[PDB]
Design a protein around this ligand. Sequence first.
Ligand SMILES: C[S@@+](CC[C@H](N)C(=O)[O-])C[C@H]1O[C@@H](n2cnc3c(N)ncnc32)[C@H](O)[C@@H]1O
Ligand code: SF4
Ligand code: SF4
Ligand code: SF4
Ligand SMILES: [Ca+2]
Length: 418
Amino acid sequence: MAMIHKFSMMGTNIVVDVNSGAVHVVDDISFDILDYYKNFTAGEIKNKLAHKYNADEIDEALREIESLEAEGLLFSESVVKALCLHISHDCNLRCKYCFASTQRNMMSLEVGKKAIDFLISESGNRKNLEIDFFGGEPMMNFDVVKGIIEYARQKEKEHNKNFRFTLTTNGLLLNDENIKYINENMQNIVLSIDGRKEVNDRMRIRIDGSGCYDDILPKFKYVAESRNQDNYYVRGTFTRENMDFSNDVLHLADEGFRQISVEPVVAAKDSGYDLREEDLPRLFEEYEKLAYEYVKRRKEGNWFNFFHFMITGCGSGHEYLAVTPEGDIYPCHQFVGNEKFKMGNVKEGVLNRDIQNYFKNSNVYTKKECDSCWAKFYCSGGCAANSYNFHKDINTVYKVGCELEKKRVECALWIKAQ
Ligand SMILES: C[S@@+](CC[C@H](N)C(=O)[O-])C[C@H]1O[C@@H](n2cnc3c(N)ncnc32)[C@H](O)[C@@H]1O
Ligand code: SF4
Ligand code: SF4
Ligand code: SF4
Ligand SMILES: [Ca+2]
């Protein structure tokens, strides 16, 4: 499986050798060489490239590319650590693209602590433990969150562990007092806002239809600077309704957000919101359009971090598990619908292993469609929710949500070239 990927993006030619991880910026002549190198002689390539370059400059271009091959940078040849807590399945929003379009109960405190104990028991001897407060809207049940935190740190002393708490909130229930507590206790907070106001208020709406932009932007802007524009990010979701998502990222940057994350929709088949292949040469340009601007404001007064350019696996189902409010264990937040992937309850606290191993053995070596790919050692490993939603199987590639990430890998590699 000796292969390379070749791309040229905004006046530069970069090459990736997949097994090595080596990255090369190359000139036009050696860039056109690799169209023929592995299958043609040095004598055959002269007659081929005898309209743009001449024999000597061709051979010198062969010289080093044949030495990178000789150097070996061309053609080279389970323990659970995090729990996604569903502190609530109720919510005060009705976002179109969200799975919570279906009941409505609150995680009890006794199920929370049975979630902390389950994590410690299955953590092996890993010291760093992650607890994500998620679900519907966790702040609707903030009493329990404070109780789970105060309970975990009593356990940190006894079990030689360390808990890393993150919250993800729609914004509506942040106030002066819970924003204090959030910054002396949560290591990271995720703010859900979709960017421009017409885009956000289009779909992050309440039961009545009214939006949430005007209410969350004031408190989001502040939580960011209360924590010095770090240890947070604003989390946006672009669907078919806003494929110009670059302005969404930059509008959030213009409002003073250094840490921004904008991602495609997951498990959005047959909703009208998912992105199709026809949109791929539409979504690509704004990724490139984005990667250009981050370099443009890299060292200037303005600057912003886009999470998907910052360069294992995602871990859902073997290293990362979601806990329903009743204690039920699921591979991730996106699977608590499907009952077949039910893996146990944190009360009884014993984990189903062969669903766990079924998920652990779904990596870039396992699936046949990945072994052909150039970004296998650069990828997230895919999204199991997207695979089962588009093909009812955890181990077949979801072609769109995949060429998106390959372009982000291409955009992240390209930023580091400057
Ligand atoms: C599921 S919500 C739960 C936490 C909290 N209520 C909030 O929105 O911040 C967390 C994040 O997941 C994202 N999300 C919801 N449904 C999604 C979907 N179908 N595809 C991709 N992201 C989604 C939303 O953008 C939201 O920011
Ligand atoms: S707020 Fe979070 S949970 Fe409620 S709908 Fe919007 S995304 Fe789903
Ligand atoms: S990108 Fe999709 S296909 Fe290429 S490796 Fe990562 S997951 Fe497998
Ligand atoms: S499966 Fe898809 S959605 Fe569930 S965690 Fe891994 S990536 Fe996020
Ligand atoms: Ca700690």
